[PDB]
Amino acid sequence: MREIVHIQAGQCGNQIGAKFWEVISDEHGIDPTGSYHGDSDLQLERINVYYNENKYVPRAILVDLEPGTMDSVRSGPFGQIFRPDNFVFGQSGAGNNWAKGHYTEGAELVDSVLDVVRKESESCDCLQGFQLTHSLGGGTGSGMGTLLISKIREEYPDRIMNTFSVMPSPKVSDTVVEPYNATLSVHQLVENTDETYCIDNEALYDICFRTLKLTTPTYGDLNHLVSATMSGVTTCLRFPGQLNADLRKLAVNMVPFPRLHFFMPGFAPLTSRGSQQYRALTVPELTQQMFDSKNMMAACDPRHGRYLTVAAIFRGRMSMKEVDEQMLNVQNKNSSYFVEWIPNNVKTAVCDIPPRGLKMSATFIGNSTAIQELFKRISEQFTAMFRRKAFLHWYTGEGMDEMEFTEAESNMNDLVSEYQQYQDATA
Amino acid sequence: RECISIHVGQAGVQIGNACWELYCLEHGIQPDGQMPSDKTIGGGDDSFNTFFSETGAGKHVPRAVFVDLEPTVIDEVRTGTYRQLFHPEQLITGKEDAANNYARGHYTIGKEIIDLVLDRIRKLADQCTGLQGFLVFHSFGGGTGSGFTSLLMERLSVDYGKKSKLEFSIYPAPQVSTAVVEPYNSILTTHTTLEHSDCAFMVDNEAIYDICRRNLDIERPTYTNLNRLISQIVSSITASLRFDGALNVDLTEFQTNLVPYPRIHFPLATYAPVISAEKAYHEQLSVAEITNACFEPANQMVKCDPRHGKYMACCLLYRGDVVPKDVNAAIATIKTKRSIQFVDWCPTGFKVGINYQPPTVVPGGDLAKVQRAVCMLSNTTAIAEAWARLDHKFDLMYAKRAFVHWYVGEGMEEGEFSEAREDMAALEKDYEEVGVDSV
Amino acid sequence: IQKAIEENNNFIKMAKEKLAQKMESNKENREAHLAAMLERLQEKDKHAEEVRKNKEL
Ligand SMILES: *[C@@H]1CC(=O)C/C(C)=C\C=C\C(=O)O[C@H]([C@H](O)NC(=O)/C=C\C=C\C)C/C(C)=C/[C@@H]2CSC[C@H](C1)O2
Ligand SMILES: Nc1nc2c(ncn2[C@@H]2O[C@H](COP(=O)(O)OP(=O)(O)OP(=O)(O)O)[C@@H](O)[C@H]2O)c(=O)[nH]1
Ligand SMILES: Nc1nc2c(ncn2[C@@H]2O[C@H](COP(=O)(O)OP(=O)(O)O)[C@@H](O)[C@H]2O)c(=O)[nH]1
Ligand SMILES: [Ca+2]
Ligand SMILES: [Mg+2]
Numbered sequence: 064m065r066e067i068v069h070i071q072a073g074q075c076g077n078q079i080g081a082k083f084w085e086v087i088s089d090e091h092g093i094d095p096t097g098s099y100h101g102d103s104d105l106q107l108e109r110i111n112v113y114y115n116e117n118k119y120v121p122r123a124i125l126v127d128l129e130p131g132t133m134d135s136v137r138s139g140p141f142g143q144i145f146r147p148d149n150f151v152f153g154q155s156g157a158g159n160n161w162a163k164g165h166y167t168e169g170a171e172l173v174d175s176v177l178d179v180v181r182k183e184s185e186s187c188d189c190l191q192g193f194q195l196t197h198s199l200g201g202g203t204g205s206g207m208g209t210l211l212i213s214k215i216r217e218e219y220p221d222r223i224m225n226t227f228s229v230m231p232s233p234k235v236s237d238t239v240v241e242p243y244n245a246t247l248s249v250h251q252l253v254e255n256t257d258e259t260y261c262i263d264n265e266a267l268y269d270i271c272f273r274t275l276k277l278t279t280p281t282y283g284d285l286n287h288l289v290s291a292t293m294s295g296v297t298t299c300l301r302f303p304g305q306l307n308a309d310l311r312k313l314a315v316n317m318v319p320f321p322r323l324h325f326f327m328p329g330f331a332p333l334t335s336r337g338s339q340q341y342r343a344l345t346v347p348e349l350t351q352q353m354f355d356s357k358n359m360m361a362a363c364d365p366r367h368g369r370y371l372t373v374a375a376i377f378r379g380r381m382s383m384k385e386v387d388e389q390m391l392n393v394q395n396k397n398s399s400y401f402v403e404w405i406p407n408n409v410k411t412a413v414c415d416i417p418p419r420g421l422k423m424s425a426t427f428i429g430n431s432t433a434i435q436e437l438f439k440r441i442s443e444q445f446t447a448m449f450r451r452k453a454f455l456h457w458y459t460g461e462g463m464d465e466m467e468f469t470e471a472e473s474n475m476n477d478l479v480s481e482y483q484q485y486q487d488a489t490a
Numbered sequence: 491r492e493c494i495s496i497h498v499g500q501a502g503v504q505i506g507n508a509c510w511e512l513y514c515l516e517h518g519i520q521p522d523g524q525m526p527s528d529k530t531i532g533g534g535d536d537s538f539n540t541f542f543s544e545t546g547a548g549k550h551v552p553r554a555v556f557v558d559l560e561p562t563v564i565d566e567v568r569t570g571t572y573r574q575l576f577h578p579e580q581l582i583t584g585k586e587d588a589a590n591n592y593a594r595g596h597y598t599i600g601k602e603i604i605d606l607v608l609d610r611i612r613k614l615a616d617q618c619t620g621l622q623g624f625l626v627f628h629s630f631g632g633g634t635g636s637g638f639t640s641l642l643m644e645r646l647s648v649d650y651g652k653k654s655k656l657e658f659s660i661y662p663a664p665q666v667s668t669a670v671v672e673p674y675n676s677i678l679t680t681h682t683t684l685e686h687s688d689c690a691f692m693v694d695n696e697a698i699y700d701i702c703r704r705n706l707d708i709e710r711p712t713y714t715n716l717n718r719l720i721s722q723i724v725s726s727i728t729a730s731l732r733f734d735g736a737l738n739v740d741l742t743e744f745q746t747n748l749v750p751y752p753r754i755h756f757p758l759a760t761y762a763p764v765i766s767a768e769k770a771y772h773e774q775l776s777v778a779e780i781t782n783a784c785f786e787p788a789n790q791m792v793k794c795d796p797r798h799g800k801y802m803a804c805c806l807l808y809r810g811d812v813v814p815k816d817v818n819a820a821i822a823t824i825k826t827k828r829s830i831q832f833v834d835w836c837p838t839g840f841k842v843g844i845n846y847q848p849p850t851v852v853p854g855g856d857l858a859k860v861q862r863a864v865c866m867l868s869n870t871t872a873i874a875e876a877w878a879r880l881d882h883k884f885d886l887m888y889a890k891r892a893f894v895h896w897y898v899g900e901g902m903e904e905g906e907f908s909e910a911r912e913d914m915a916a917l918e919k920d921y922e923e924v925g926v927d928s929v
Numbered sequence: 930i931q932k933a934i935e936e937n938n939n940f941i942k943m944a945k946e947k948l949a950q951k952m953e954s955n956k957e958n959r960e961a962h963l964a965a966m967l968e969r970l971q972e973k974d975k976h977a978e979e980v981r982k983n984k985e986l
């Protein structure tokens with residue numbers, strides 16, 4: 064009815080993309096062969112948003128410049144659910160170089176990706192738009208992913224473009240050029256996406272390590288959090304409901320100025336199994352946790368800025384009256400942190416189906432000016448390198464000019480100033 | 491003297507569902523459209539024929555079009571309980587909605603379906619021997635209810651001239667709203683529609699929500715709870731058109747008294763009794779009780795305080811076991827006791843109608859079945875408070891142009907926002923001016 | 930009666946014309962927003978050509 068086409072690019076993008084599909088397939092009662100075996104009609108009612116149709120096949124395109132991650136996806140759990148012809152991969156790799164993904168190797172592959180995008184799009188009853196999963200700190204997801212965004216946008220200019228964009232952190236990768244690849248990518252996202260979930264590896268790491276007490280978090284551990292979040296933030300798109308039920312309604316509610324389209328996602332509950340013995344899982348606990356810095360998947364403290372807009376989704380069996388009351392309370396006690404010139408800027412949905420293994424959960428989507436803290440962190444790492452022209456030859460050797468770096472940096476600094484402007488504005 | 495109902499977008503459609511179900515129960519029409527008590531097969535000129543046409547096979551078919559820019563709400567009508575009541579062609583859908591954006595409803599998406607909707611309304615009109623006018627049900631806040639309604643009302647002025655157009659308009663509340671931009675959409679549609687509408691009954695979702703919570707003891711009202719109450723109010727208002735009787739007074743005659751100047755066309759509706767089965771049990775609520783309840787601000791369908799404005803008209807629409815003697819005694823008491831100041835240029839007499847047909851309730855509803863009910867329609871300067879609240883929310887966002895790019899992106903200009911807001915300022919000022927004393 | 934006819938006709942006429950003018954202005958505006966968007970995207974394709982040319986030296 065209102066289809067979304069999903070693209071996953073590069074290593075990170077394919078890894079979190081595969082977990083997204085495993086988790087939502089389980090939620091909708093779809094098994095690894097594509098057969099429906101669930102128990103609630105809620106599961107099938109909007110299945111067409113994500114699955115073609117006695118089997119259900121993800122509307123999903125898997126892209127990479129080398130075969131290895133996609134080979135493991137294919138042999139992973141749920142790997143035979145994907146359409147075989149929707150795997151598009153080269154052999155070269157991108158060498159963790161954005162320029163190779165965006166301008167050289169990625170450019171050589173992009174038309175064959177577009178062929179598949181078009182085939183999926185053309186058999187849609189009424190395509191809403193696109194969701195991309197990728198990292199910003201590598202080469203393929205970052206460089207080729209942003210290339211695909213601009214190419215798709217040319218052919219589908221009035222459709223929504225949404226990303227799940229994984230931001231780098233020195234706590235997770237020591238690859239030294241990550242700040243360059245991320246700054247060049249943010250430059251593209253600012254101009255060419257409608258809505259971006261900022262999934263910060265810094266925050267995923269700190270949640271794993273400090274809250275869940277995992278001494279040495281794996282990508283697996285990080286991705287489990289991401290898949291919880293991605294499930295949460297797509298709940299309104301794929302289950303019956305009132306609020307934010309499609310990509311464009313979400314954008315209209317969440318994006319007051321076109322460039323300010325970078326969301327801080329958050330998930331509750333996030334409590335260690337040992338602390339679970341002490342703390343009950345209740346609506347007030349979810350509500351308190353979802354507005355806490357420690358539950359945000361971007362490493363920014365919302366109390367260091369203000370909220371332009373917020374979407375709160377609760378999942379599971381619970382009292383609607385108690386939800387309304389807690390959501391009013393949390394707004395009242397936090398009133399300073401919600402801009403006064405956007406009245407009624409927090410919306411609340413409830414879906415009766417919880418995530419697997421929880422009685423209830425909540426998901427937060429914040430458009431907060433405190434997201435400037437993430438861009439500033441990237442910006443500081445970028446400039447420490449660029450001031451010394453470190454490692455530029457990898458990018459100029461692909462034909463880029465220093466001017467493009469200066470321009471990406473300036474654009475990202477301008478984004479930061481714009482968040483500050485609206486943070487400081489009053490009624 | 492036919493009336494054609496048009497139900498636009500989700501709110502207009504779901505309220506239409508509730509209204510048509512209630513109308514069928516009030517007239518004895520089954521879900522398959524059969525009406526065993528109607529002995530004229532295939533036609534006639536009964537009062538109920540204002541709202542229902544008849545087929546030769548005995549089907550009583552609403553004079554109604556339902557339209558929505560996406561299909562999923564109208565699909566429930568098409569597959570649900572009353573699916574046989576409507577001809578398929580009366581239920582019209584597109585595939586992609588207006589995304590809470592007036593610009594999409596009035597322009598980008600609306601324009602693709604407007605011709606077809608006008609075609610279908612024309613086919614209804616063509617079966618009427620004396621069409622009196624239209625009743626249009628819509629939200630203020632949604633993209634379709636705002637923008638498509640506006641487009642449709644402009645197009646109907648062109649195709650039907652000054653034939654009567656009345657609205658039932660759903661004014662937004664935060665407890666059930668779905669968009670941050672609802673103020674913008676409300677002001678845009680109020681501006682665009684104002685010269686095309688003869689009379690508009692606003693229903694504030696927050697007033698209804700509150701009434702449901704307070705008087706029906708519903709902890710967290712749903713649209714279903716809200717819409718069942720709204721339908722009773724709508725029913726009270728249209729009952730004069732659908733039933734006859736010696737003391738029935740047509741809605742158009744109330745209209746004469748309600749609308750002193752073309753733009754001053756927004757009556758305040760107040761309804762009583764709203765009570766649960768459990769409280770209504772063993773308690774007979776007299777004509778005096780239900781009448782005094784109409785001057786309680788808590789029972790009003792729009793939050794505002796009439797005690798702090800002036801009246802330009804007061805109409806009482808009774809239904810059920812009500813005789814003028816009891817009415818007159820009740821009005822006499824109320825006049826000695828309440829805050830009822832008229833402007834100096836109007837008569838202070840209350841205008842009364844009585845329909846004998848008792849009120850009906852839908853199975854599994856919240857409202858007690860009662861012997862007598864009343865709907866007061868007043869023209870008070872206090873209703874302007876509702877415009878001031880929306881205007882203020884508009885001003886807060888507009889000063890920063892928050893969300894305006896979504897509208898501009900669909901082809902609108904800033905000048906349309908300032909024109910709409912200027913007209914609303916003029917309307918607020920019109921409401922002040924009419925309440926000032928004559929020199 | 931002629932006056933009443935004239936004013937009803939003039940009301941129709943003016944509502945018809947105002948609407949035609951808004952739907953045209955709306956259309957041209959929306960089209961221009963789209964054309965600008967596509968022209969930015971095309972500038973980018975041209976820039977990527979230059980990069981790949983710059984590399985070949
Ligand atoms: C996770 C699947 C998996 O492999 C790991 C397992 C078996 C369980 C993980 C649970 C987990 O991470 O739980 C967290 C959180 O610690 N839970 C609580 O805080 C619970 C109660 C708190 C009370 C005060 C929540 C979480 C991220 C769950 C997600 C939901 S999406 C499905 C994944 C699968 O788990
Ligand atoms: N009383 C009542 N209000 C409703 C109902 N459905 C929606 N609303 C209100 O209407 C507004 C949202 O507009 P909708 O009618 O859903 O939107 P739409 O006209 O379908 O427009 P789009 O979906 O944007 O194309 C909010 O203020 C909702 O609270 C309903 O059935 N009853
Ligand atoms: N959360 C998460 N981050 C990952 C994963 N794989 C790689 N990354 C991060 O992504 C960046 C490296 O980019 P990568 O996706 O490997 O390169 P590409 O294959 O060229 O797109 C670094 O910031 C890594 O920490 C993964 O599965 N999950
Ligand atoms: Ca008959
Ligand atoms: Mg890698």
Ligand SMILES: [Mg+2]
Nearest residue numbers: 499500587632
């Ligand atoms: Mg709708």
